[PDB]
Design a protein around this ligand. Structure first.
Ligand SMILES: CCOP(=O)(COc1ccc(C[C@H](NC(=O)O[C@H]2CO[C@H]3OCC[C@H]32)[C@H](O)CN(CC(CC)CC)S(=O)(=O)c2ccc3c(c2)OCO3)cc1)OCC
Lengths: 99, 99
């Protein structure tokens, strides 16, 4: 589809057997999701933006479905104020910017 | 143009007569630039990102050209980690997400 940017580009995602709302974020290198108790091993990471850095858990090879488009890659989990789908997954679903 | 997301969607912008590089950031409501001198009145504002809140200077009705497309809108100036073009200006240049 085509998503205009009058409002936040929020979509439903499926991850870890759960549905959530997440931002299609071209400014996010990585995908960052609200706290959730995913199974498996993880690695500590810190990511920064406006206001500073937060601590997150890095999970690799996680399956996410975005608007019916399947993707698999790294997902960071932590106390982020919003779920953001980053470029690592946006490329996998064929997402472009157009003007 | 159509812009893929394998790398950061960085583009050249023109503001206050000066050229800069900025990130097209669909996850940003607002446009936030690194510290710079801009002519005209401004008001102090606060904006929040993934790591907390920062203090910025708000400039209204500023001319800014983004990849050869003109916009006139609000530009926030402060200690952002990178120059970001937010949805307030992306809508003006007709930018959409497509997959
Ligand atoms: C419930 C209350 O919410 P809230 O207000 C905050 O909510 C939000 C809403 C959207 C975002 C997304 C963020 N947008 C943003 O900052 O926009 C601000 C300007 O316009 C306003 O619009 C929204 C906030 C304001 C960027 O799109 C992406 N970011 C990097 C970007 C920085 C600008 C470029 C470096 S990033 O998230 O940091 C990040 C993601 C993956 C990574 C990474 C860093 O590093 C590797 O991988 C983040 C928090 O709380 C305040 C305490």
């Amino acid at each position: 589809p085509q998503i205009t940017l009058w409002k936040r580009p929020l979509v439903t995602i499926k991850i870890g057997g759960q549905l959530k709302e997440a931002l299609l974020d071209t400014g996010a290198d990585d995908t960052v999701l609200e706290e959730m108790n995913l199974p498996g091993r993880w690695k500590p990471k810190m990511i920064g933006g406006i206001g500073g850095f937060i601590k997150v858990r890095q999970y690799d090879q996680i399956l996410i479905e975005i608007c019916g488009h399947k993707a698999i890659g790294t997902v960071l989990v932590g106390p982020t104020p919003v779920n953001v789908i980053g470029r690592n997954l946006l490329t996998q679903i064929g997402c472009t910017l157009n003007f």
